[PDB]
Structure formats: structure tokens, C-alpha cells
Amino acid sequence: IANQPVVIDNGSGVIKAGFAGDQIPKYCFPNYVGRPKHVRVMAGALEGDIFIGPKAEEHRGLLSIRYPMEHGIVKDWNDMERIWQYVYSKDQLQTFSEEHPVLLTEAPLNPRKNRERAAEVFFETFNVPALFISMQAVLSLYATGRTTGVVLDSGDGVTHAVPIYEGFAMPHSIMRIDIAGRDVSRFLRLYLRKEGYDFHSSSEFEIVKAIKERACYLSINPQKDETLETEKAQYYLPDGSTIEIGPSRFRAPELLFRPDLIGEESEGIHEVLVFAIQKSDMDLRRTLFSNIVLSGGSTLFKGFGDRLLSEVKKLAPKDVKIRISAPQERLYSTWIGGSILASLDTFKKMWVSKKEYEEDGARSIHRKTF
Amino acid sequence: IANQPVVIDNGSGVIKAGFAGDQIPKYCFPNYVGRPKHVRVMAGALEGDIFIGPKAEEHRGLLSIRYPMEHGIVKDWNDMERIWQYVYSKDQLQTFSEEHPVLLTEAPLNPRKNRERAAEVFFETFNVPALFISMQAVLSLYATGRTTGVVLDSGDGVTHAVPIYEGFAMPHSIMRIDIAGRDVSRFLRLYLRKEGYDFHSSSEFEIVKAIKERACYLSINPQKDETLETEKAQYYLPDGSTIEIGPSRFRAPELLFRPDLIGEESEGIHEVLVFAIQKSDMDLRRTLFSNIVLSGGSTLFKGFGDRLLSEVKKLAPKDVKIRISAPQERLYSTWIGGSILASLDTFKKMWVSKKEYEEDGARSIHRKTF
Amino acid sequence: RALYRIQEKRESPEVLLTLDILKHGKRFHATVSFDTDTGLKQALETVNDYNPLMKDFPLNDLLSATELDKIRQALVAIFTHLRKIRNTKYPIQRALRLVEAISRDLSSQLLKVLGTRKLMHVAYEEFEKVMVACFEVFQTW
Ligand SMILES: Nc1ncnc2c1ncn2[C@@H]1O[C@H](COP(=O)(O)OP(=O)(O)O)[C@@H](O)[C@H]1O
Ligand SMILES: Nc1ncnc2c1ncn2[C@@H]1O[C@H](COP(=O)(O)OP(=O)(O)O)[C@@H](O)[C@H]1O
Ligand SMILES: [Mg+2]
Ligand SMILES: [Mg+2]
């Protein structure tokens, strides 16, 4: 049934779901499953043993939290099936999976088994008419309104730079590292433990994520701010008590720009971007430096753009125009692109029809994904 | 009866096209076909798999470059058909091919099948009213305005010394070698590799060609400049990086005067000229030495004229005045000659008419060209 | 012609200003769909590619022919014009269907001319002249 297709930006930390043609993702919620930690004792307690969406956030302290996917790869598939069912529930999208094509998204350079199982879940558990699994850089470029650019997407679980010139993707310049917002939040939890505040529960880890979102920033340069030893700032916990953050405010998001702070022998986000640009052809490099597009929630850190510009200037050639485009809707750029793409009449030629899946199976989605 | 004839000097490096009577070729573009080598992912990308002309130069980093001609001989005839179609497109000459006689140019001592297939393409595919396959050197001399002399045309693919007496090219004194500007640029690529700066891509061969056109010269004394300490002039690449050239700056155009640097047991350009002069009649040698006309792009190296004059004086007899003429319009000398020839009313008596080709075939061009 | 008219309208200042305003409001849905989903570029490419074959087709000479030699010459002209298909990217199956249609027109024209001839009424030698002319037309085909 050729109703409006359903666009599901399948983030590692937050899922953004809506119908194609909508200006913004109407149904966004965290990508985790909460289960009641304690014992149900009273008649008339909360119904159901699986809490997903704002119901999980309202009763966050009551629940033990599990994230179905890590680094863009689904680890628990029953939880992912539950969450994608919740996307279709009476609360979210109030619709039937059978009647709407689906535009899914995944990180680049992901395992093939992930795509295979996602297609299997969306064609067998849900009897979707049509599925299309799309990479996210193209959606960032659609949302920002370009055809040329290098998309540096840093989300909850995966950071990656994808260069595209005139709508042609360079698949061999795609850089990816598994350092993203969740790693920064874990590092911030470690630093807070080193202050004296132990946040070992999972709801307390969500509190740490809120701390990272609210009170954390990237200094323009690390050495002078590290040596200054500035004063501490007060953050109010949910229960009313206060904590002194201090150096954890800025030493935590520095994990993006040097993953060796946790022993990972990986590249910084600036090195990811510059390597993606410099692996491209020699003539496209100057154009790619002038068109850098930020995406994902981890690029929203206070002072992120300034530090990234300074680092890319340090790494780029002399007198090269670097211009980083950082739209306001960095969180929802991927979904807005998916909505723009799914609304096109050309989108009918891209998806994998259900009968086409039955004919081939994993081969159909493997061919038509790229 | 037909429209004004169209002159098409199709070199190995750059094609130069226009209408007869123009002072200069208004429609010059490189003689290669660019095909995109990356993955088209989004709607709104560049349209078409074939990029010819300035569209190929604008997106040069996106394309694999293929040269149809090699040493003045068409190796890929589909690409040649595409390029000649582009010569007639709305971007160049804005006219239909069924209305204008054509004056194609061909390098001397080419394969017979090359001329036959070119005429077949021009009479069948393009349905030209008439055709005339000329020779480049005699046209260059016509452009100079002289009637007797020696034309040492050194282009991208083939260099050749042709003596002409009163407008007639002596065919038993034509000297030709296949070492030309493209060979010099390949040698320059090899030397830059020997200097640490490595280029592989067909698009980066154009960067090497630009380096040749920008920073390369012919030293008057190769052995003197060889032993001295180099200056290492720095060249700025398109991406903004810099490279120090040094000894490769002058040893690269040395290939014209010493083919043995690439293991070829063929004459040098000075030897080509002198052997063409000395193979002619003993009566004409003095006036041929007194009338030498340079042509083609490879004759534009800094110090080319002085070096060639020194070499010819070394090889020429004493008490013989040597005058190498180096007109400013060396690149378009042969096209200007084709335009001068096609303007005359006698050109009506020179072309192979369409009916003549229809009734005879390859024999019509075989008698009419010679 | 209609696609050229649509293209001329698309380049007018009003359409460009509307698209620029929608871009400045970040309403990229409409602008991207207008750029891509129209199919105007592909249609223009197809019709411009087909134009040399369709331009100045001599079919009228076959349709206006009232004598068998004129029909034969019109068929010569029609096939010589159909030889221009190499320059285009026309579908070959569509070309064979066009040849089918040209055969239909040839049959209709021959039927009309022979109806004006009244073959059975005239003497036998005139009938033989008309027959050899018609079979020369078929051999030309
Ligand atoms: N204002 C902010 N400052 C810093 N980090 C943020 C901010 N807003 C969101 N984030 C981080 O971004 C992540 C969510 O990014 P998202 O765009 O959902 O990526 P994905 O699509 O891969 O899930 C969260 O882990 C959160 O920690
Ligand atoms: N200023 C210059 N210095 C050195 N080489 C040049 C210069 N300009 C053009 N060339 C070389 O000349 C070649 C083109 O010469 P041209 O006369 O167009 O050849 P053709 O006869 O094949 O058209 C190119 O390969 C280019 O490398
Ligand atoms: Mg994301
Ligand atoms: Mg030439």
C-alpha cells in the first residue's frame, strides 16, 4: 500500500521516526529499553514490563536501562524489535507496518550481518511493502541543501567523515571511528568518579549523559586551559543535591579529539575529517575543505566548531579556505534528509520491494543499498 | 553548395575547431573523454557518464581521463565519435553537421586505415556534404604566409619535420618521430616519482601536464646545467600543497632532443629537422635552412628556439644561414592555415564530395588527399 | 516544443525567485523535488536526441504521392532519412515499429492509387505496366 513512507533515523542513542514530507521528526525518543528493577507489589502499579519512549524517562529511576545497539551495531535484536514495534504503537505514529514503506538508516562501513538482519526483521516480523537502508551523509547533505561537501557526523555511538562531490560518494575516503557521545559520557562518568561522585547505576548513567549535555564544553586549545586550573562549577542533581564538576567539564569532551585518553589507538575527530578529505582526489580537496557539514549530537558541544576549525587549520595546507557549516538542526539533519529523500518520486526506484526480497533475500538489499 | 566549411584541427592533445575565415580557432578544448569513477548516491548529481570539454576540466578530480588519440593515431573510435559530436554540440559551433564541409587535419605518415575510418565516420555518422583530410605542416606554413620552408611541428602526440617547396610538401623528405609533449609529460611524471612526488591517477597526469607547461625549460648547455647545484623552484599544487622540482625542471624537456633517455633508438627533434633538410634536394638545402618554421605546443618551452638553433648549427654545414621562425600563434598556426585554405574558392575543387565517397569510398580520399 | 516551452518558463525570474525564497526558508523538500522529480532534464535530453530523426521527415512526399514512381522516390527518401538513426539513441524496436507504420502508410497509398487506376477495367498491357511499376515499388522496399 503506497501510503506515505515512514522515515526512521535509527540512531545509536536516539531514534527519530516520522512520516516522509514532515518538516521535522515528529516522534523522537531515546534508543534504550527500560525494565522494572524492583518488585511489583501493589495492584494498580505500572502496566507492562518493557518501558520505551517518554514513559521510560518519566519513571527513569524505577528502571534498569539497556541500549540495544552499540557503535551503530545492534547487539540485542529482541530489544530492537521491541523498539521498532513501539515506533508503530498507538503512542508513536499510530499506524500499521504493512501499509507504509520504510526508510532506515545505518552508519557507514557497518557489518553486513547488521543490514541483513535489519532487512529480515523489517520484512518478516513487520510485513513492510518496501525497505531502503540509506547512509547518513547523503541525508545530511539533503537536509542542508547541498550536493557537494564532506559530512562529519558524530552521533551517540559512531563518528565518521564521508566526502561527497557533486553527488558522487567517495567510498574509499570514508573514515570511521567508534568514539562518539556515549564514549564521551563514559569518560565523563570516570572523571566524575575521580572527583568523588560515583554514578554506577544505569539511570545514574543517564544523569551523567544529562550532565554532559548541560555542563560541558571544548576549550579552544587544551594546554592553556589545562594549566590554568580554573574554578569549579555547580551542577544540580535530580534529587536536589549539588556537585562540583571542575576539570571534568572540559577534559571529558576532549576524548573526541584524542581517543588515547582511554587507551584507544584511534584518530581524533579532526584527523578523521582531514584524512577523509586528503584521501580524496587532489583536485577535490580544496572544494571539500570549503564545504564541511557537521551532523549528529556530539557536534553540539560548546566550542566544538571553533576547536575543530583550529585543528583542521593546523592540519590543512597553508592559506586554504576552511569553512565548517554547522546548521542549527544538527541533531535532526539525518532525519530531515531521509524525509526529503523519501518524498521523491525517484525513491520508488530505490527501495527493495517485498517480492524482490523473497526472490533474492540479502542479495537484493546488498545490491540496492549502494 | 553548402555552408561555410568547418576547420577541425584534431591534435592528440587538444582539438581546435571553428569556421573558416575566423582569425583564431574560437572552439579549442582538450582531446580526452572523462568518465566519473565514483559512486553516484544522490539525486541531483552530475548528469551523463561522458564529460568532454570544460565540463571535464571543472570536475577534473571526479573523472578518469581517457585519451582516444596516441601518437596522432586514433586508438578509441567511439571516444573520437563522442568528441567530434561534442565539436558540433550546442556548446561548440552550435550547428548541424549535415550542412558544413569539413577540413580535418592528420599528421604525416599516419596509418591509411586511420584516414579511411575518419572519412567513414565523417561521411556516415555526421553526413557532412564534403571532406578534405589535410596535413598539419603545410597548413602551418600557409598560415605563416611563406610558400617554401621547413615546418618542424612538435605537438602532444607526434613531432615531424616536413619540407615544403612552393606549397607542395616533399613526401620523401618527411621526418617523423612519436616523441612529443605527452611523452615529455610522462617522462616528467617519472622524474617527479624519482624526486618523491608520486602521481598515479589519470586526473593527476593533467596536474603533471600543468607542471610541464608552467615550470619547465630547456637549458642551452645540458651538461653544464647538469653538474651545477639546482635552484629547486617550488610549484603550488591545486590542493594547496607545494613541491620542490629541482633537476627535473630541465631534464624533462630534454627528452625532445635525446629520446635515448627513455630507451628509444630514434632521432632527436634537431636530428629530425636536419635529416629532413638533408634528405631533400641539394639545391633546396640553403633555402630550407634559411626558412624553418616552428609549430605545435611543445615548441613553447622556455629557451626552445635557442637550443634548437644551437643543435642545428652543430649539425648543419658552415656558411649556411639558419633562421628558425617562432611565430606567436604557434598553437593555432595549423588551424589558421586550415582556415586560410578553406576560405579560398579553390577549396571547392579539393574536397571529396559526399557523392564521390558514396560511389568510390576510400579511394576517393586516397586520390584527392595526395 | 512543449518541453522547450516548459524549460523557458522554468528559467523565468518568477520561478527562480520562488525557489530561492524556499531555499532561504530551508524548505528543501519542494526545491529538491522540483529539481529532480520533474523529469524535465531527461525528457529534454530524449527529445533533443530524437530531433535529428524527426526533423524534416520526408513522409509527406509519400503521403502526397499520386504516381507509382513518385511513391518509389518517396520511399527512397524515407529510408535515406531513416539512415540518420545512427546519430541518435532511438530505440531500435521503436524504429522497427516506425517501419511497420511506414509500411501501413505505403499500403494505404498504394491502395488509393490502384483504386484510382481501376485495374480490372483497363486493357491487359496497361495492367501489366501498372503491375511492373507496383512490383518495382515493392522491390525498392
Ligand atoms: N547540546 C549537546 N551537547 C553535547 N552533546 C549532546 C547535545 N545534545 C545531544 N548530545 C549528544 O548527542 C548524542 C545523540 O546524537 P544523535 O544525533 O542521536 O546521534 P545518533 O543519531 O547516532 O544517535 C547523545 O549521546 C548526546 O550525548
Ligand atoms: N607553454 C607551454 N610550454 C610547454 N608545453 C606546452 C605549452 N603549451 C602547451 N604545451 C604542450 O603542447 C601540447 C599541445 O600541443 P598542440 O600543438 O595542441 O598539439 P596537437 O598538434 O596535438 O594539437 C600539450 O600536450 C602540452 O603539454
Ligand atoms: Mg546519527
Ligand atoms: Mg597540431
mmCIF file with all atom_site columns, C-alpha atoms in Angstrom, chain B residues 207-354:
data_model
loop_
_atom_site.group_PDB
_atom_site.id
_atom_site.type_symbol
_atom_site.label_atom_id
_atom_site.label_alt_id
_atom_site.label_comp_id
_atom_site.label_asym_id
_atom_site.label_entity_id
_atom_site.label_seq_id
_atom_site.pdbx_PDB_ins_code
_atom_site.Cartn_x
_atom_site.Cartn_y
_atom_site.Cartn_z
_atom_site.occupancy
_atom_site.B_iso_or_equiv
_atom_site.pdbx_formal_charge
_atom_site.auth_seq_id
_atom_site.auth_comp_id
_atom_site.auth_asym_id
_atom_site.auth_atom_id
_atom_site.pdbx_PDB_model_num
ATOM 1   C CA . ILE B 1 207 ? 48.493 18.127 -12.978 1.00 0.00 ? 207 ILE B CA 1
ATOM 2   C CA . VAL B 1 208 ? 51.796 16.778 -14.311 1.00 0.00 ? 208 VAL B CA 1
ATOM 3   C CA . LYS B 1 209 ? 50.967 18.316 -17.695 1.00 0.00 ? 209 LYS B CA 1
ATOM 4   C CA . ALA B 1 210 ? 50.287 21.638 -15.970 1.00 0.00 ? 210 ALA B CA 1
ATOM 5   C CA . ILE B 1 211 ? 53.631 21.385 -14.155 1.00 0.00 ? 211 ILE B CA 1
ATOM 6   C CA . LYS B 1 212 ? 55.303 20.842 -17.528 1.00 0.00 ? 212 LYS B CA 1
ATOM 7   C CA . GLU B 1 213 ? 53.522 23.832 -19.058 1.00 0.00 ? 213 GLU B CA 1
ATOM 8   C CA . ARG B 1 214 ? 54.290 26.076 -16.058 1.00 0.00 ? 214 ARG B CA 1
ATOM 9   C CA . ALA B 1 215 ? 57.770 25.227 -14.695 1.00 0.00 ? 215 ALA B CA 1
ATOM 10  C CA . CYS B 1 216 ? 59.985 23.562 -17.296 1.00 0.00 ? 216 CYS B CA 1
ATOM 11  C CA . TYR B 1 217 ? 62.668 24.979 -19.568 1.00 0.00 ? 217 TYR B CA 1
ATOM 12  C CA . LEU B 1 218 ? 65.375 23.881 -21.992 1.00 0.00 ? 218 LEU B CA 1
ATOM 13  C CA . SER B 1 219 ? 68.911 24.644 -20.866 1.00 0.00 ? 219 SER B CA 1
ATOM 14  C CA . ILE B 1 220 ? 71.254 25.854 -23.588 1.00 0.00 ? 220 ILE B CA 1
ATOM 15  C CA . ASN B 1 221 ? 74.039 23.557 -22.301 1.00 0.00 ? 221 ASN B CA 1
ATOM 16  C CA . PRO B 1 222 ? 72.617 20.345 -20.767 1.00 0.00 ? 222 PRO B CA 1
ATOM 17  C CA . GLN B 1 223 ? 75.929 19.122 -19.349 1.00 0.00 ? 223 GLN B CA 1
ATOM 18  C CA . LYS B 1 224 ? 76.739 22.482 -17.745 1.00 0.00 ? 224 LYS B CA 1
ATOM 19  C CA . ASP B 1 225 ? 73.358 22.764 -16.013 1.00 0.00 ? 225 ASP B CA 1
ATOM 20  C CA . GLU B 1 226 ? 73.548 19.068 -15.091 1.00 0.00 ? 226 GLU B CA 1
ATOM 21  C CA . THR B 1 227 ? 76.694 19.409 -12.961 1.00 0.00 ? 227 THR B CA 1
ATOM 22  C CA . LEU B 1 228 ? 75.692 22.628 -11.164 1.00 0.00 ? 228 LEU B CA 1
ATOM 23  C CA . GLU B 1 229 ? 73.636 22.850 -7.986  1.00 0.00 ? 229 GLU B CA 1
ATOM 24  C CA . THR B 1 230 ? 69.932 23.182 -8.711  1.00 0.00 ? 230 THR B CA 1
ATOM 25  C CA . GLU B 1 231 ? 67.656 26.013 -7.589  1.00 0.00 ? 231 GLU B CA 1
ATOM 26  C CA . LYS B 1 232 ? 64.625 23.859 -6.646  1.00 0.00 ? 232 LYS B CA 1
ATOM 27  C CA . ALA B 1 233 ? 61.804 26.140 -7.725  1.00 0.00 ? 233 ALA B CA 1
ATOM 28  C CA . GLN B 1 234 ? 58.607 25.414 -5.799  1.00 0.00 ? 234 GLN B CA 1
ATOM 29  C CA . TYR B 1 235 ? 55.294 24.697 -7.526  1.00 0.00 ? 235 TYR B CA 1
ATOM 30  C CA . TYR B 1 236 ? 51.893 25.051 -5.850  1.00 0.00 ? 236 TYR B CA 1
ATOM 31  C CA . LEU B 1 237 ? 49.594 22.102 -6.479  1.00 0.00 ? 237 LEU B CA 1
ATOM 32  C CA . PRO B 1 238 ? 45.816 22.551 -6.945  1.00 0.00 ? 238 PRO B CA 1
ATOM 33  C CA . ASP B 1 239 ? 45.048 21.320 -3.418  1.00 0.00 ? 239 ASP B CA 1
ATOM 34  C CA . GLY B 1 240 ? 47.403 23.951 -1.937  1.00 0.00 ? 240 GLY B CA 1
ATOM 35  C CA . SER B 1 241 ? 50.423 21.725 -1.267  1.00 0.00 ? 241 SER B CA 1
ATOM 36  C CA . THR B 1 242 ? 53.856 22.621 -2.639  1.00 0.00 ? 242 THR B CA 1
ATOM 37  C CA . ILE B 1 243 ? 56.538 20.545 -4.363  1.00 0.00 ? 243 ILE B CA 1
ATOM 38  C CA . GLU B 1 244 ? 60.224 21.313 -4.973  1.00 0.00 ? 244 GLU B CA 1
ATOM 39  C CA . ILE B 1 245 ? 61.132 20.363 -8.540  1.00 0.00 ? 245 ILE B CA 1
ATOM 40  C CA . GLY B 1 246 ? 64.856 20.987 -8.934  1.00 0.00 ? 246 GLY B CA 1
ATOM 41  C CA . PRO B 1 247 ? 66.719 18.905 -11.540 1.00 0.00 ? 247 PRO B CA 1
ATOM 42  C CA . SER B 1 248 ? 63.547 17.517 -13.145 1.00 0.00 ? 248 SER B CA 1
ATOM 43  C CA . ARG B 1 249 ? 62.675 21.040 -14.317 1.00 0.00 ? 249 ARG B CA 1
ATOM 44  C CA . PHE B 1 250 ? 65.104 20.922 -17.277 1.00 0.00 ? 250 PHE B CA 1
ATOM 45  C CA . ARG B 1 251 ? 65.774 17.198 -17.776 1.00 0.00 ? 251 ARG B CA 1
ATOM 46  C CA . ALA B 1 252 ? 62.107 16.589 -18.670 1.00 0.00 ? 252 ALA B CA 1
ATOM 47  C CA . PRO B 1 253 ? 62.035 18.671 -21.894 1.00 0.00 ? 253 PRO B CA 1
ATOM 48  C CA . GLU B 1 254 ? 65.473 17.223 -22.680 1.00 0.00 ? 254 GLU B CA 1
ATOM 49  C CA . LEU B 1 255 ? 63.592 14.163 -23.958 1.00 0.00 ? 255 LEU B CA 1
ATOM 50  C CA . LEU B 1 256 ? 62.738 16.030 -27.163 1.00 0.00 ? 256 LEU B CA 1
ATOM 51  C CA . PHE B 1 257 ? 66.428 16.344 -28.087 1.00 0.00 ? 257 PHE B CA 1
ATOM 52  C CA . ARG B 1 258 ? 67.514 12.956 -26.664 1.00 0.00 ? 258 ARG B CA 1
ATOM 53  C CA . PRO B 1 259 ? 64.940 10.149 -26.977 1.00 0.00 ? 259 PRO B CA 1
ATOM 54  C CA . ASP B 1 260 ? 67.530 7.675  -25.657 1.00 0.00 ? 260 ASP B CA 1
ATOM 55  C CA . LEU B 1 261 ? 66.655 8.904  -22.151 1.00 0.00 ? 261 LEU B CA 1
ATOM 56  C CA . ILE B 1 262 ? 63.656 6.536  -22.459 1.00 0.00 ? 262 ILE B CA 1
ATOM 57  C CA . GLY B 1 263 ? 65.476 3.805  -24.381 1.00 0.00 ? 263 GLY B CA 1
ATOM 58  C CA . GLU B 1 264 ? 64.145 4.747  -27.826 1.00 0.00 ? 264 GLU B CA 1
ATOM 59  C CA . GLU B 1 265 ? 66.685 4.434  -30.648 1.00 0.00 ? 265 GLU B CA 1
ATOM 60  C CA . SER B 1 266 ? 65.053 7.247  -32.615 1.00 0.00 ? 266 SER B CA 1
ATOM 61  C CA . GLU B 1 267 ? 66.294 10.607 -33.825 1.00 0.00 ? 267 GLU B CA 1
ATOM 62  C CA . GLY B 1 268 ? 66.061 13.775 -31.781 1.00 0.00 ? 268 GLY B CA 1
ATOM 63  C CA . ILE B 1 269 ? 63.959 16.756 -32.765 1.00 0.00 ? 269 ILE B CA 1
ATOM 64  C CA . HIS B 1 270 ? 67.030 18.635 -34.019 1.00 0.00 ? 270 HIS B CA 1
ATOM 65  C CA . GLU B 1 271 ? 68.088 15.473 -35.846 1.00 0.00 ? 271 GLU B CA 1
ATOM 66  C CA . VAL B 1 272 ? 64.570 15.200 -37.289 1.00 0.00 ? 272 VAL B CA 1
ATOM 67  C CA . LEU B 1 273 ? 64.814 18.738 -38.670 1.00 0.00 ? 273 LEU B CA 1
ATOM 68  C CA . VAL B 1 274 ? 68.352 18.400 -40.020 1.00 0.00 ? 274 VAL B CA 1
ATOM 69  C CA . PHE B 1 275 ? 67.697 14.998 -41.606 1.00 0.00 ? 275 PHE B CA 1
ATOM 70  C CA . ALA B 1 276 ? 64.540 16.332 -43.238 1.00 0.00 ? 276 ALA B CA 1
ATOM 71  C CA . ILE B 1 277 ? 66.578 19.205 -44.675 1.00 0.00 ? 277 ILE B CA 1
ATOM 72  C CA . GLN B 1 278 ? 69.481 16.995 -45.792 1.00 0.00 ? 278 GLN B CA 1
ATOM 73  C CA . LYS B 1 279 ? 67.199 14.347 -47.321 1.00 0.00 ? 279 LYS B CA 1
ATOM 74  C CA . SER B 1 280 ? 65.818 16.969 -49.732 1.00 0.00 ? 280 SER B CA 1
ATOM 75  C CA . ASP B 1 281 ? 67.376 18.247 -52.947 1.00 0.00 ? 281 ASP B CA 1
ATOM 76  C CA . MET B 1 282 ? 70.861 19.718 -52.755 1.00 0.00 ? 282 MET B CA 1
ATOM 77  C CA . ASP B 1 283 ? 69.535 22.873 -54.437 1.00 0.00 ? 283 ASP B CA 1
ATOM 78  C CA . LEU B 1 284 ? 66.860 23.469 -51.782 1.00 0.00 ? 284 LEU B CA 1
ATOM 79  C CA . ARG B 1 285 ? 69.018 22.909 -48.686 1.00 0.00 ? 285 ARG B CA 1
ATOM 80  C CA . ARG B 1 286 ? 70.155 26.531 -48.406 1.00 0.00 ? 286 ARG B CA 1
ATOM 81  C CA . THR B 1 287 ? 66.639 27.977 -48.664 1.00 0.00 ? 287 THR B CA 1
ATOM 82  C CA . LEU B 1 288 ? 65.258 25.261 -46.380 1.00 0.00 ? 288 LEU B CA 1
ATOM 83  C CA . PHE B 1 289 ? 67.869 26.127 -43.754 1.00 0.00 ? 289 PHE B CA 1
ATOM 84  C CA . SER B 1 290 ? 67.034 29.806 -44.213 1.00 0.00 ? 290 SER B CA 1
ATOM 85  C CA . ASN B 1 291 ? 63.288 29.036 -43.756 1.00 0.00 ? 291 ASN B CA 1
ATOM 86  C CA . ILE B 1 292 ? 62.468 26.966 -40.651 1.00 0.00 ? 292 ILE B CA 1
ATOM 87  C CA . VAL B 1 293 ? 59.041 27.437 -39.048 1.00 0.00 ? 293 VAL B CA 1
ATOM 88  C CA . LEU B 1 294 ? 58.224 26.111 -35.589 1.00 0.00 ? 294 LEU B CA 1
ATOM 89  C CA . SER B 1 295 ? 54.727 24.920 -34.763 1.00 0.00 ? 295 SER B CA 1
ATOM 90  C CA . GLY B 1 296 ? 52.767 22.975 -32.185 1.00 0.00 ? 296 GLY B CA 1
ATOM 91  C CA . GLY B 1 297 ? 52.581 23.241 -28.431 1.00 0.00 ? 297 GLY B CA 1
ATOM 92  C CA . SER B 1 298 ? 55.832 21.503 -27.493 1.00 0.00 ? 298 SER B CA 1
ATOM 93  C CA . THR B 1 299 ? 57.840 24.268 -29.212 1.00 0.00 ? 299 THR B CA 1
ATOM 94  C CA . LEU B 1 300 ? 56.801 26.717 -26.454 1.00 0.00 ? 300 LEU B CA 1
ATOM 95  C CA . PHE B 1 301 ? 59.356 25.550 -23.877 1.00 0.00 ? 301 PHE B CA 1
ATOM 96  C CA . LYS B 1 302 ? 61.474 28.365 -22.492 1.00 0.00 ? 302 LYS B CA 1
ATOM 97  C CA . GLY B 1 303 ? 64.698 28.504 -24.473 1.00 0.00 ? 303 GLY B CA 1
ATOM 98  C CA . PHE B 1 304 ? 63.431 26.081 -27.121 1.00 0.00 ? 304 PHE B CA 1
ATOM 99  C CA . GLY B 1 305 ? 64.425 28.318 -30.023 1.00 0.00 ? 305 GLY B CA 1
ATOM 100 C CA . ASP B 1 306 ? 67.971 28.985 -28.835 1.00 0.00 ? 306 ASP B CA 1
ATOM 101 C CA . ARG B 1 307 ? 68.558 25.314 -28.033 1.00 0.00 ? 307 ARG B CA 1
ATOM 102 C CA . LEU B 1 308 ? 67.251 24.126 -31.401 1.00 0.00 ? 308 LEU B CA 1
ATOM 103 C CA . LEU B 1 309 ? 69.290 26.784 -33.202 1.00 0.00 ? 309 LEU B CA 1
ATOM 104 C CA . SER B 1 310 ? 72.426 25.650 -31.373 1.00 0.00 ? 310 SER B CA 1
ATOM 105 C CA . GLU B 1 311 ? 71.762 21.993 -32.208 1.00 0.00 ? 311 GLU B CA 1
ATOM 106 C CA . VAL B 1 312 ? 71.025 22.725 -35.872 1.00 0.00 ? 312 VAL B CA 1
ATOM 107 C CA . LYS B 1 313 ? 74.162 24.862 -36.140 1.00 0.00 ? 313 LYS B CA 1
ATOM 108 C CA . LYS B 1 314 ? 76.118 21.967 -34.643 1.00 0.00 ? 314 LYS B CA 1
ATOM 109 C CA . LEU B 1 315 ? 74.659 19.607 -37.268 1.00 0.00 ? 315 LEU B CA 1
ATOM 110 C CA . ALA B 1 316 ? 74.264 21.999 -40.207 1.00 0.00 ? 316 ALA B CA 1
ATOM 111 C CA . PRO B 1 317 ? 77.049 22.865 -42.666 1.00 0.00 ? 317 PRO B CA 1
ATOM 112 C CA . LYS B 1 318 ? 79.073 26.004 -42.156 1.00 0.00 ? 318 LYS B CA 1
ATOM 113 C CA . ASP B 1 319 ? 78.492 29.152 -44.258 1.00 0.00 ? 319 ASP B CA 1
ATOM 114 C CA . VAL B 1 320 ? 74.737 28.423 -44.262 1.00 0.00 ? 320 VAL B CA 1
ATOM 115 C CA . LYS B 1 321 ? 72.432 30.989 -42.669 1.00 0.00 ? 321 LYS B CA 1
ATOM 116 C CA . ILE B 1 322 ? 69.958 29.404 -40.238 1.00 0.00 ? 322 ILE B CA 1
ATOM 117 C CA . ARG B 1 323 ? 66.727 31.248 -39.387 1.00 0.00 ? 323 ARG B CA 1
ATOM 118 C CA . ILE B 1 324 ? 64.282 29.458 -37.083 1.00 0.00 ? 324 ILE B CA 1
ATOM 119 C CA . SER B 1 325 ? 60.960 31.315 -37.101 1.00 0.00 ? 325 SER B CA 1
ATOM 120 C CA . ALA B 1 326 ? 58.850 31.063 -33.932 1.00 0.00 ? 326 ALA B CA 1
ATOM 121 C CA . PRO B 1 327 ? 55.566 32.909 -34.546 1.00 0.00 ? 327 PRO B CA 1
ATOM 122 C CA . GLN B 1 328 ? 53.388 33.876 -31.608 1.00 0.00 ? 328 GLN B CA 1
ATOM 123 C CA . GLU B 1 329 ? 50.418 31.810 -32.852 1.00 0.00 ? 329 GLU B CA 1
ATOM 124 C CA . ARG B 1 330 ? 52.322 28.514 -32.733 1.00 0.00 ? 330 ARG B CA 1
ATOM 125 C CA . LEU B 1 331 ? 49.441 26.656 -31.074 1.00 0.00 ? 331 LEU B CA 1
ATOM 126 C CA . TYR B 1 332 ? 46.898 27.770 -33.701 1.00 0.00 ? 332 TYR B CA 1
ATOM 127 C CA . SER B 1 333 ? 49.206 28.076 -36.722 1.00 0.00 ? 333 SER B CA 1
ATOM 128 C CA . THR B 1 334 ? 47.930 24.889 -38.349 1.00 0.00 ? 334 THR B CA 1
ATOM 129 C CA . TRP B 1 335 ? 44.304 25.814 -37.674 1.00 0.00 ? 335 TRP B CA 1
ATOM 130 C CA . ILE B 1 336 ? 44.877 29.286 -39.112 1.00 0.00 ? 336 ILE B CA 1
ATOM 131 C CA . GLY B 1 337 ? 46.321 27.569 -42.164 1.00 0.00 ? 337 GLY B CA 1
ATOM 132 C CA . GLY B 1 338 ? 43.266 25.361 -42.486 1.00 0.00 ? 338 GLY B CA 1
ATOM 133 C CA . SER B 1 339 ? 41.088 28.462 -42.238 1.00 0.00 ? 339 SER B CA 1
ATOM 134 C CA . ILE B 1 340 ? 43.127 30.223 -44.931 1.00 0.00 ? 340 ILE B CA 1
ATOM 135 C CA . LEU B 1 341 ? 42.916 27.194 -47.230 1.00 0.00 ? 341 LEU B CA 1
ATOM 136 C CA . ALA B 1 342 ? 39.189 26.690 -46.683 1.00 0.00 ? 342 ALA B CA 1
ATOM 137 C CA . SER B 1 343 ? 38.450 30.356 -47.432 1.00 0.00 ? 343 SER B CA 1
ATOM 138 C CA . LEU B 1 344 ? 39.773 30.032 -50.992 1.00 0.00 ? 344 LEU B CA 1
ATOM 139 C CA . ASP B 1 345 ? 37.466 29.192 -53.874 1.00 0.00 ? 345 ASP B CA 1
ATOM 140 C CA . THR B 1 346 ? 39.966 26.526 -54.953 1.00 0.00 ? 346 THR B CA 1
ATOM 141 C CA . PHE B 1 347 ? 38.989 24.534 -51.848 1.00 0.00 ? 347 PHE B CA 1
ATOM 142 C CA . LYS B 1 348 ? 35.756 23.679 -53.673 1.00 0.00 ? 348 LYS B CA 1
ATOM 143 C CA . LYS B 1 349 ? 37.897 21.691 -56.126 1.00 0.00 ? 349 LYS B CA 1
ATOM 144 C CA . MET B 1 350 ? 39.807 19.958 -53.295 1.00 0.00 ? 350 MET B CA 1
ATOM 145 C CA . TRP B 1 351 ? 37.223 18.251 -51.098 1.00 0.00 ? 351 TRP B CA 1
ATOM 146 C CA . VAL B 1 352 ? 35.833 14.769 -51.628 1.00 0.00 ? 352 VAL B CA 1
ATOM 147 C CA . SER B 1 353 ? 32.133 15.332 -52.223 1.00 0.00 ? 353 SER B CA 1
ATOM 148 C CA . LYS B 1 354 ? 29.575 13.143 -50.479 1.00 0.00 ? 354 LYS B CA 1
#
